[PDB]
Design an enzyme around this catalytic site. Sequence first.
Site, PDB file in Angstrom:
ATOM      1  N   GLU A 144       0.694  -1.299  -0.036  1.00  0.00           N
ATOM      2  CA  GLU A 144       0.030  -0.035  -0.030  1.00  0.00           C
ATOM      3  C   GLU A 144       0.820   1.351  -0.073  1.00  0.00           C
ATOM      4  O   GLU A 144       0.677   2.113  -0.888  1.00  0.00           O
ATOM      5  CB  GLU A 144      -0.999  -0.163   1.089  1.00  0.00           C
ATOM      6  CG  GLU A 144      -2.425   0.304   0.825  1.00  0.00           C
ATOM      7  CD  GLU A 144      -3.497  -0.329   1.630  1.00  0.00           C
ATOM      8  OE1 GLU A 144      -3.312  -0.117   2.690  1.00  0.00           O
ATOM      9  OE2 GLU A 144      -4.253  -0.978   1.109  1.00  0.00           O
ATOM     10  N   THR A 170      10.212   5.857  19.488  1.00  0.00           N
ATOM     11  CA  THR A 170      10.323   7.088  19.613  1.00  0.00           C
ATOM     12  C   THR A 170      11.463   7.576  18.413  1.00  0.00           C
ATOM     13  O   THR A 170      11.270   7.014  17.219  1.00  0.00           O
ATOM     14  CB  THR A 170      11.731   7.009  20.839  1.00  0.00           C
ATOM     15  OG1 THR A 170      13.170   6.407  20.545  1.00  0.00           O
ATOM     16  CG2 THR A 170      11.335   5.872  22.048  1.00  0.00           C
ATOM     17  N   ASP A 171      12.383   8.303  18.532  1.00  0.00           N
ATOM     18  CA  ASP A 171      12.914   8.935  17.334  1.00  0.00           C
ATOM     19  C   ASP A 171      13.887   7.932  16.994  1.00  0.00           C
ATOM     20  O   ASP A 171      14.742   7.918  15.866  1.00  0.00           O
ATOM     21  CB  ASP A 171      13.794  10.214  17.900  1.00  0.00           C
ATOM     22  CG  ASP A 171      12.787  11.407  17.670  1.00  0.00           C
ATOM     23  OD1 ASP A 171      12.289  11.545  16.874  1.00  0.00           O
ATOM     24  OD2 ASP A 171      12.906  12.071  19.075  1.00  0.00           O
ATOM     25  N   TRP A 203      15.588  26.839  52.282  1.00  0.00           N
ATOM     26  CA  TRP A 203      15.885  25.704  53.293  1.00  0.00           C
ATOM     27  C   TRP A 203      17.438  25.969  53.287  1.00  0.00           C
ATOM     28  O   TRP A 203      18.083  24.895  53.848  1.00  0.00           O
ATOM     29  CB  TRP A 203      15.621  24.390  53.011  1.00  0.00           C
ATOM     30  CG  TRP A 203      14.207  23.899  53.177  1.00  0.00           C
ATOM     31  CD1 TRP A 203      13.391  24.263  54.439  1.00  0.00           C
ATOM     32  CD2 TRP A 203      13.262  23.050  52.444  1.00  0.00           C
ATOM     33  NE1 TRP A 203      12.172  23.725  54.524  1.00  0.00           N
ATOM     34  CE2 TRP A 203      12.120  23.082  53.247  1.00  0.00           C
ATOM     35  CE3 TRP A 203      13.459  22.607  51.233  1.00  0.00           C
ATOM     36  CZ2 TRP A 203      10.928  22.236  52.849  1.00  0.00           C
ATOM     37  CZ3 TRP A 203      12.414  21.915  50.775  1.00  0.00           C
ATOM     38  CH2 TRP A 203      10.968  21.702  51.557  1.00  0.00           C
ATOM     39  N   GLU A 218       5.853  16.397  41.602  1.00  0.00           N
ATOM     40  CA  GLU A 218       4.747  17.350  42.113  1.00  0.00           C
ATOM     41  C   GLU A 218       4.999  18.852  42.306  1.00  0.00           C
ATOM     42  O   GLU A 218       3.924  19.433  42.340  1.00  0.00           O
ATOM     43  CB  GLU A 218       4.572  16.874  43.728  1.00  0.00           C
ATOM     44  CG  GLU A 218       4.315  15.356  43.983  1.00  0.00           C
ATOM     45  CD  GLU A 218       4.390  14.880  45.351  1.00  0.00           C
ATOM     46  OE1 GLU A 218       5.244  15.228  46.119  1.00  0.00           O
ATOM     47  OE2 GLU A 218       3.245  14.270  45.517  1.00  0.00           O
TER      48      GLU A 218
HETATM   49  N1  ATP Z   1      11.637  27.750  55.770  1.00  0.00           N
HETATM   50  C1  ATP Z   1      10.803  26.871  56.219  1.00  0.00           C
HETATM   51  N2  ATP Z   1      10.914  27.240  57.664  1.00  0.00           N
HETATM   52  C2  ATP Z   1      10.221  26.327  58.627  1.00  0.00           C
HETATM   53  N3  ATP Z   1       9.541  25.247  57.914  1.00  0.00           N
HETATM   54  C3  ATP Z   1       9.351  24.946  56.695  1.00  0.00           C
HETATM   55  C4  ATP Z   1      10.041  25.776  55.863  1.00  0.00           C
HETATM   56  N4  ATP Z   1       9.781  25.433  54.444  1.00  0.00           N
HETATM   57  C5  ATP Z   1       9.165  24.328  54.587  1.00  0.00           C
HETATM   58  N5  ATP Z   1       8.791  24.017  55.994  1.00  0.00           N
HETATM   59  C6  ATP Z   1       7.721  22.934  56.563  1.00  0.00           C
HETATM   60  O1  ATP Z   1       8.063  21.742  55.694  1.00  0.00           O
HETATM   61  C7  ATP Z   1       6.947  21.623  54.789  1.00  0.00           C
HETATM   62  C8  ATP Z   1       7.031  21.278  53.417  1.00  0.00           C
HETATM   63  O2  ATP Z   1       7.171  19.610  53.184  1.00  0.00           O
HETATM   64  P1  ATP Z   1       8.077  19.052  52.215  1.00  0.00           P
HETATM   65  O3  ATP Z   1       8.374  20.222  51.085  1.00  0.00           O
HETATM   66  O4  ATP Z   1       9.318  18.725  52.741  1.00  0.00           O
HETATM   67  O5  ATP Z   1       7.513  17.796  51.621  1.00  0.00           O
HETATM   68  P2  ATP Z   1       6.562  16.679  51.898  1.00  0.00           P
HETATM   69  O6  ATP Z   1       5.902  17.015  53.152  1.00  0.00           O
HETATM   70  O7  ATP Z   1       7.455  15.553  51.751  1.00  0.00           O
HETATM   71  O8  ATP Z   1       5.412  16.516  50.705  1.00  0.00           O
HETATM   72  P3  ATP Z   1       4.467  17.565  50.101  1.00  0.00           P
HETATM   73  O9  ATP Z   1       4.879  18.865  50.258  1.00  0.00           O
HETATM   74  O10 ATP Z   1       4.083  17.175  48.699  1.00  0.00           O
HETATM   75  O11 ATP Z   1       3.042  17.469  51.011  1.00  0.00           O
HETATM   76  C9  ATP Z   1       5.994  22.589  55.424  1.00  0.00           C
HETATM   77  O12 ATP Z   1       4.454  22.047  55.539  1.00  0.00           O
HETATM   78  C10 ATP Z   1       6.331  23.198  56.507  1.00  0.00           C
HETATM   79  O13 ATP Z   1       5.908  22.880  57.747  1.00  0.00           O
HETATM   80  N1  ATP Z   2       9.797   9.859  15.702  1.00  0.00           N
HETATM   81  C1  ATP Z   2       8.709   9.199  15.973  1.00  0.00           C
HETATM   82  N2  ATP Z   2       8.827   9.315  17.078  1.00  0.00           N
HETATM   83  C2  ATP Z   2       7.744   8.787  18.008  1.00  0.00           C
HETATM   84  N3  ATP Z   2       6.473   8.102  17.374  1.00  0.00           N
HETATM   85  C3  ATP Z   2       6.646   8.037  15.848  1.00  0.00           C
HETATM   86  C4  ATP Z   2       7.808   8.699  15.038  1.00  0.00           C
HETATM   87  N4  ATP Z   2       7.669   8.303  13.878  1.00  0.00           N
HETATM   88  C5  ATP Z   2       6.401   7.694  13.955  1.00  0.00           C
HETATM   89  N5  ATP Z   2       6.047   7.571  15.073  1.00  0.00           N
HETATM   90  C6  ATP Z   2       4.523   6.918  15.513  1.00  0.00           C
HETATM   91  O1  ATP Z   2       4.796   5.429  14.956  1.00  0.00           O
HETATM   92  C7  ATP Z   2       3.596   4.931  14.226  1.00  0.00           C
HETATM   93  C8  ATP Z   2       4.027   4.392  12.868  1.00  0.00           C
HETATM   94  O2  ATP Z   2       3.344   3.234  12.595  1.00  0.00           O
HETATM   95  P1  ATP Z   2       3.588   2.466  11.545  1.00  0.00           P
HETATM   96  O3  ATP Z   2       3.994   3.455  10.147  1.00  0.00           O
HETATM   97  O4  ATP Z   2       5.017   1.683  11.836  1.00  0.00           O
HETATM   98  O5  ATP Z   2       2.693   1.175  11.022  1.00  0.00           O
HETATM   99  P2  ATP Z   2       1.555   0.611  11.537  1.00  0.00           P
HETATM  100  O6  ATP Z   2       0.746   1.433  12.545  1.00  0.00           O
HETATM  101  O7  ATP Z   2       1.747  -0.852  11.934  1.00  0.00           O
HETATM  102  O8  ATP Z   2       0.525   0.421  10.146  1.00  0.00           O
HETATM  103  P3  ATP Z   2      -0.142   1.405   9.271  1.00  0.00           P
HETATM  104  O9  ATP Z   2       0.506   1.078   8.031  1.00  0.00           O
HETATM  105  O10 ATP Z   2      -1.754   0.878   9.243  1.00  0.00           O
HETATM  106  O11 ATP Z   2      -0.107   2.689   9.620  1.00  0.00           O
HETATM  107  C9  ATP Z   2       2.845   6.500  14.006  1.00  0.00           C
HETATM  108  O12 ATP Z   2       1.619   6.027  14.368  1.00  0.00           O
HETATM  109  C10 ATP Z   2       3.306   7.159  15.037  1.00  0.00           C
HETATM  110  O13 ATP Z   2       2.540   7.486  16.207  1.00  0.00           O
HETATM  111 MG    MG Z   3       6.744  17.994  47.504  1.00  0.00          MG
END
Ligand code: ATP
Ligand code: ATP
Ligand code: MG
Lengths: 148, 74, 506, 59
Positions: free
Chosen positions: C64, C227-228, C318, C305
């Site tokens: 094709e 991928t590439d 910190w 996150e």
């Molecule tokens: N400069 C600072 N002085 C005193 N306490 C701080 C300071 N910065 C951050 N904190 C404290 O540390 C906490 C931040 O948590 P942290 O960023 O370490 O990650 P985590 O608890 O592991 O994950 P997540 O933030 O996603 O919940 C705050 O809630 C706070 O009580």
């Molecule tokens: N550089 C690239 N990086 C990431 N994905 C790519 C790249 N080039 C192509 N693709 C992906 O790979 C796919 C190519 O499919 P392919 O041409 O191999 O044959 P097929 O899907 O098996 O059959 P058909 O002839 O029905 O399309 C594309 O659908 C696309 O998502």
């Molecule tokens: Mg965090």
Amino acid sequence: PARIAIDSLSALARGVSNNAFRQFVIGVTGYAKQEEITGLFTNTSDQFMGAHSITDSHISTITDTIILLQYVEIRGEMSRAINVFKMRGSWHDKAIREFMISDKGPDIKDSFRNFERIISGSPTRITVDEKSELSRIVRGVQEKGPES
Amino acid sequence: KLRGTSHMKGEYPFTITDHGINIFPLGAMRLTQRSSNVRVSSGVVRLDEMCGGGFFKDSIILATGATGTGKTLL
Amino acid sequence: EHQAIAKMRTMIEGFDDISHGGLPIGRSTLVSGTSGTGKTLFSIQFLYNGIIEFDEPGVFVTFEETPQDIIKNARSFGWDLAKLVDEGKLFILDASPDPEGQEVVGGFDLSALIERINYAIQKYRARRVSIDSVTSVFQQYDASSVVRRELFRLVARLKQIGATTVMTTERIEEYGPIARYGVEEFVSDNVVILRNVLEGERRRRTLEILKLRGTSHMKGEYPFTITDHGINIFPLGAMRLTQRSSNVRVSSGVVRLDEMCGGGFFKDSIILATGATGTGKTLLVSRFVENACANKERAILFAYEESRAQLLRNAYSWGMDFEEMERQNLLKIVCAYPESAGLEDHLQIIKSEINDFKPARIAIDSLSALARGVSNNAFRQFVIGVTGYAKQEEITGLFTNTSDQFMGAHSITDSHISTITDTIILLQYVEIRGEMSRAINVFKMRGSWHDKAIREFMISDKGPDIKDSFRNFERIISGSPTRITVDEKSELSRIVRGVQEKGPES
Amino acid sequence: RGEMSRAINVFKMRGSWHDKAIREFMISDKGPDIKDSFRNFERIISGSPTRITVDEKSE
Ligand SMILES: Nc1ncnc2c1ncn2[C@@H]1O[C@H](COP(=O)(O)OP(=O)(O)OP(=O)(O)O)[C@@H](O)[C@H]1O
Ligand SMILES: Nc1ncnc2c1ncn2[C@@H]1O[C@H](COP(=O)(O)OP(=O)(O)OP(=O)(O)O)[C@@H](O)[C@H]1O
Ligand SMILES: [Mg+2]
Ligand SMILES: Nc1ncnc2c1ncn2[C@@H]1O[C@H](COP(=O)(O)OP(=O)(O)OP(=O)(O)O)[C@@H](O)[C@H]1O
Ligand SMILES: [Mg+2]
């Protein structure tokens, strides 16, 4: 806007799937974030008192600062408490402060220092001899300093 | 598929509005949001204190609690 | 090698492991899948790698696509087929029909084709052959039995000629019949199925070797990525448990912790830090990454996150200047939403970046964030993948986990990664007197002794300060303990009255 | 005390101030009679209280 507030993300999660919801949150969250807009979001936990997780939908990692409100049963009464659970770049207070609500709005009072199990909604009041030791009657070792 | 090049995979939600098709590549949004140290008030001073001087301007704040606790007040 | 069948290497990454050596020589392998699954790419890569690595000429039969298109498209992967067609290493044999034609011709053409392909093979001294979409040929007006006979005729003649062939087929259902006429499955010696599964709006490609008459091979589905560089397959179950293990130690970036861990982490180890949101897992990560720079080693912080900006504002607050680590070319930050991809992709991006930067330390902030959405078994598979790579690569790894419930959490992890990990650092909130304090604990360490205390710790601008255990407390893990006192006031330095100075002098 | 009593609480009210006490109440032919809160109790909410009976400051 400079600020944005969504009253009840938890009401938007009604019905929808958790993964569709999380996707929405990241959506409005990151938009606000990249736009320099400070955003305040609301979440009503499904159970009053005893809530074991910040959010039922597990958004609390997608958020920078967490403000937590909770009922505390104190002497046959329903009082509130506010706690800055976490704050990413700052220091924030670690106290679970009691607070009232009036026409004036929110008044944040003190922590319940003399209680245990507050997080749970039903503390255990507990002085039973406050921090001055069973030596409030200070022994009588002090029976000398004063004389005639 | 697009024979010859790459593309995002999967489903992407979109809306048909008065401005035609609008697609949100929610998985195409990058983790490159600007972050400052600038503060801002909550509308509650004492709160501001507890938060070490107010909410950051660049931030997502979340207020959780039971029904009736006062999220809507904050 | 104890396998009764001689195989030919495809050099497609991961395929030769799956196929226990490559494609059986002299036989044909059916490769089928739905639209866009990578069929054409596989067969091209097969001929290409064959030419560039073994100087094995190839014949590509297209029913094709157009020869210009097959060449145009291969540029996507940086392959210049035109040059090879030129040097006579590759011959694309145009069998597609005309945009102007008739109707009727699928069997004497099936003879015309046989005779044709034999000419090309003979002329170019070809060893590899790929027939792209044989399906489309009888998609002229045929029924199952006619297809079975024609296929069989072709495969058969090809085997006589001595050619190792790849034949491509289409399927309409991701899990239904193997190929269209439900007849190709049994007529080929080997069958490979390319799948592109939906499931939750994300797409996951998997490759499966269903059969290979004569030898063994890996069974089941294997995730791969286009991928590439073409197809890339990860035989996550082909990874062996033979990772090197040293006794060498490294710092965590926190001295007190190092003590707790009986002298720092093991270079060769997977460390896990879990605790509720806000406990500071991110702080420790920051401090673990910074420490490898202060020692002029390379490290990668994969963040799922926080933004790269935020990570920086927070880090600077910190202490630790992430800015510098970046410039000095010692620290590399990644950043990506777990949703911006499927686990397979993520896993490869991580590997990829570990190769280009050769880190000595790596930190994934929030595995628990990568678990968002995905099924536990797909997630565990991802963890074993990143974990094991790190392990066999002598790269120390610190992974983060946020637990779904603050306080009262009954398991280290909700996903049960807890056996896949060597050292477990545990962070938790303790309600002490109307206040939320934190506690840190070296829960386990495989080859060391580590401290068993649940020390309380504070966070400042200076960072983490690890204090003492809550000795006069029971129900610590519960999150809100009970204070009991055999003492407290006992020495430690009682000697009352005027024990301090104030700011003026001392 | 080995009996099943009732209690009423105005859990929330949007525009007003409402009382925050969990008040005991009985039911008769007259209808609902709302008495007092269980001030000297713990874990009321849970349904299975614990009366404090604190030995004051005990002087
Ligand atoms: N400069 C600072 N002085 C005193 N306490 C701080 C300071 N910065 C951050 N904190 C404290 O540390 C906490 C931040 O948590 P942290 O960023 O370490 O990650 P985590 O608890 O592991 O994950 P997540 O933030 O996603 O919940 C705050 O809630 C706070 O009580
Ligand atoms: N550089 C690239 N990086 C990431 N994905 C790519 C790249 N080039 C192509 N693709 C992906 O790979 C796919 C190519 O499919 P392919 O041409 O191999 O044959 P097929 O899907 O098996 O059959 P058909 O002839 O029905 O399309 C594309 O659908 C696309 O998502
Ligand atoms: Mg965090
Ligand atoms: N004028 C007032 N004076 C004293 N208390 C008030 C007043 N208005 C409201 N309240 C109290 O505050 C509560 C109202 O809560 P609010 O509207 O802030 O939102 P919420 O608790 O976050 O969410 P929701 O109302 O949906 O439950 C009432 O339950 C009540 O106890
Ligand atoms: Mg409301």
